[PDB]
Design a protein around this ligand. Sequence first.
Ligand SMILES: *c1ccc([N+](=O)[O-])cc1C(=O)Nc1ccccc1
Ligand SMILES: CCCCCCCCC(=O)O
Length: 258
Amino acid sequence: ESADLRALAKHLYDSYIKSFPLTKAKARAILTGKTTDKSPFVIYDMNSLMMGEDKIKEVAIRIFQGCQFRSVEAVQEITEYAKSIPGFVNLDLNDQVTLLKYGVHEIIYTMLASLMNKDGVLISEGQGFMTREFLKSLRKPFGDFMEPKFEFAVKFNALELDDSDLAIFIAVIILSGDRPGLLNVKPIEDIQDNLLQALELQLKLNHPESSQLFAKLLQKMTDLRQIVTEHVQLLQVIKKTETDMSLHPLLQEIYKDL
Ligand SMILES: *c1ccc([N+](=O)[O-])cc1C(=O)Nc1ccccc1
Ligand SMILES: CCCCCCCCC(=O)O
């Protein structure tokens, strides 16, 4: 019944608003800088980076540590949103942990896209804005840590998804079932099947003239996979480049190579 699917869509949206403080609707309002109830401070050079302390170790390193702390926050929020996904908390515990461990990064970049345009990315809850170029011009083991994310975002943001869309889509991502090592795949897939039905009907109703958006959205899951693998291997470079650099354990746990 389509009415049951709309109610799951409503449920996940509601829970998405409660778990993610910076929605895409907010992010866009801040970025489309004429709804200026509060506009961001813009970091485009090392000069503004210091003035950013006045409003909102090595430069690229502590840029990287701040990006790192934010990932911990995002994982926390994603973990909270997952629990609201019906059936998720009744799966085997080891699989719950496995679904998060692999799903978290794919979600982080889906939602990072909402904070991006071609020119840069919102930071500090939308109080700041770092330009693509300032990042791209960081020192070589850090200069390229965000460019593929910018590349994905512009492609992803062209589908014009709104938060109610994304809520269902990031639920589809967690409840995958092809994650390495799942003890009990079939109940995952029954959940995901219901999420996909939810997503299908949501995309149809919310975007009636956007042909095969559903398919175009699922296809985007290959772009996400590649970005994650690109990311983990640049992380292991930096681990050997600076054996004095430290990585949050919640992030370490998620990072098991191979
Ligand atoms: C940036 C650098 C390093 C990591 N990491 O060690 O996992 C993560 C990030 C990153 O993408 N942070 C982030 C997540 C969500 C929103 C803004 C920034
Ligand atoms: C939404 C808060 C983001 C603050 C993290 C600062 C660096 C973020 C990044 O470069 O991706």
